[PDB]
Amino acid sequence: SFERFEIFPKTSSWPNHDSDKGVTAACPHAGAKSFYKNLIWLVKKGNSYPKLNQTYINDKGKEVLVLWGIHHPPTIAAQESLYQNADAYVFVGTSRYSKKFKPEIATRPKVRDQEGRMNYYWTLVEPGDKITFEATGNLVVPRYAFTMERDAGSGIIISDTPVH
């Protein structure tokens, strides 16, 4: 079983932050700048990035796959222009997964005309468990989570053969 649901609604979960300017030219969509559909890049809302705390409780009877991202800007000026905290930190916590991520602000070789980077992390939340997001900055919040129930196991086929 694999269904996608809105773990955090865009219209009610982030009132104190900006969820509309997180678009870049590294992900074109019909020419205009865009971003991932299942993720939201939160930026400052007018020179203010208050501490963000959110949580989700797994009311489903199956597992939920939750994906998020940590952004590493190229320069300190970019970090202040996007979040304005300099010394930001992210923390994601479940009953088993606890981890703190601090941004690495440095200039990397250009890939897709991007000096900064974005690490993507995933976790599986069990029924009854909860996932907590804390963030002073540099966090790409989940917008869609995947409620899944898994089978015994299989593989991935890399072929150009048609499907019938």
Place this chain on the structure above:
Amino acid sequence: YINDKGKEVLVLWGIHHPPTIAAQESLYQNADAYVFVGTSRYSKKFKPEIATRPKVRDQEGRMNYYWTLVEPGDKITFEATGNLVVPRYAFTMERDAGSGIIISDTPVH
């Protein structure tokens, strides 16, 4: 600790991550504490991760448990400004070729 026995010594310790900064000063009074555990082969500096986590057994913080094997003639050094669960008992071992762990309810005879 210097390993004067002729066998290996398993040493276990822990690093505590409190939920709030206030708890950190309530227990260790240093805010920016650090730990360092070192051998001739092992060397690691631990920093507390102070954040609130989903409650497990009515606990907001966590305790990460680490272990190391000190060879004969070697020494293990603990340095800590705070957030250290020190060893009290270590285990001297001489190890066999290798076996397994059986999970069963069969009686032992």
